[PDB]
Amino acid sequence: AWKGEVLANNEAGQVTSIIYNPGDVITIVAAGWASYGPTQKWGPQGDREHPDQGLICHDAFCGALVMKIGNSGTIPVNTGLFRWVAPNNVQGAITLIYNDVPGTYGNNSGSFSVNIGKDQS
Amino acid sequence: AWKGEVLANNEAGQVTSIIYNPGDVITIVAAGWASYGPTQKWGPQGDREHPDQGLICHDAFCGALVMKIGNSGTIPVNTGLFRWVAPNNVQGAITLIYNDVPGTYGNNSGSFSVNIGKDQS
């Protein structure tokens, strides 16, 4: 299992120690408070009131936690995934990222604390 | 495992099918949007800026998801619990509740969706 922090101002994202292999079932739980700019802070689902101005993930709100598995596209994580299997045969290392517009991560603050484990299969 | 919804307006909370027994390890993932009165909505960690005016759980913000195991006191859940083990002596059915001040749930709205399962131990 992996336990770590994902900083909201890190545009490259946080590489974890988890490799997602074919057939793996995983569980993620995320908590904490971060902002894409404003003084207010939001949790791992982000800000449902902010429009999408070119987010790295169009299926999650600005300020949400998202991930990539290997060379996949971005996949929403939000507060977590329960006993989840990756669709479409994706595989590889798990990278966690804060959902913002590329080039605008410099004014971001806060972080999420994230647990990832593999389930029985 | 159990999956279900917990309404923000329900002072009685939502009884699940999960009975927590001594030594159990559990994982909970919660998601969704609710409000304790305002037009804005918050996720399962609640509103970090709002004062405690007599919440059912003083260890979580107003608007957070909390639980009871049997006749325990309230326990914060927030966005979830990863491979968690209860304090000594706690046992019984898990009831999920929205954290507000008793008598004031009448202006609350929305709901959280919650998954619970038992882990290997």
Add this chain to the structure above:
Amino acid sequence: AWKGEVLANNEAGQVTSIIYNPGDVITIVAAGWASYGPTQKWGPQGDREHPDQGLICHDAFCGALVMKIGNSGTIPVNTGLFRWVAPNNVQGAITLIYNDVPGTYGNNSGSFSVNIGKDQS
């Protein structure tokens, strides 16, 4: 999880720390060599050639590993059980026992090494 030894000459059985509760899924793996009397030894399935002369469990051979769950009758374990659910209405502490005729354990030797865990549910 519990790991320990079950001595072949212990007629009372070895009480483990595992309490089997309704809904639990368990895995057991047993190993080792034991005898009910002869100089030869057998593994946890026991001796398929020996007759049942009053065994504490009639559904397993003499010299097999069996168990009781609380006050239940005996249940065969043999080499182990994979992600197993107990009959309804049995619960309580798991006791592990070598299968011999009562009164006749004094000439037994050897032991089984046994591991028990609870699985995801």
Add this chain to the structure above:
Amino acid sequence: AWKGEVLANNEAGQVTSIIYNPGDVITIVAAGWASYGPTQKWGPQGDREHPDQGLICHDAFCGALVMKIGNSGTIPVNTGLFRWVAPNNVQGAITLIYNDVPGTYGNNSGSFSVNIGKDQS
């Protein structure tokens, strides 16, 4: 998970669907009766009284269940492995084999039933 049978007279062994990846935790439970030649049968720990005359796995008795993981040497399985992690730099598909001397499998009989699953990690 994988469930199947390992035949005592199959010298090549049985390639399963389980790929052991770095960091995996696995559980194997084996049961049944087989022989390496004699009329008598033994369980998955084989025959502790039989000399090693060139076994594929010198770390297990003749008639035991063993495995290979990818490019590994043979590894004893016996009655099973509980929540087991492989040595460093062992990975690949799990092949299960009956322990006998090469060229002497033709007179073997019986089989073991085997369950393999991945555990939480």
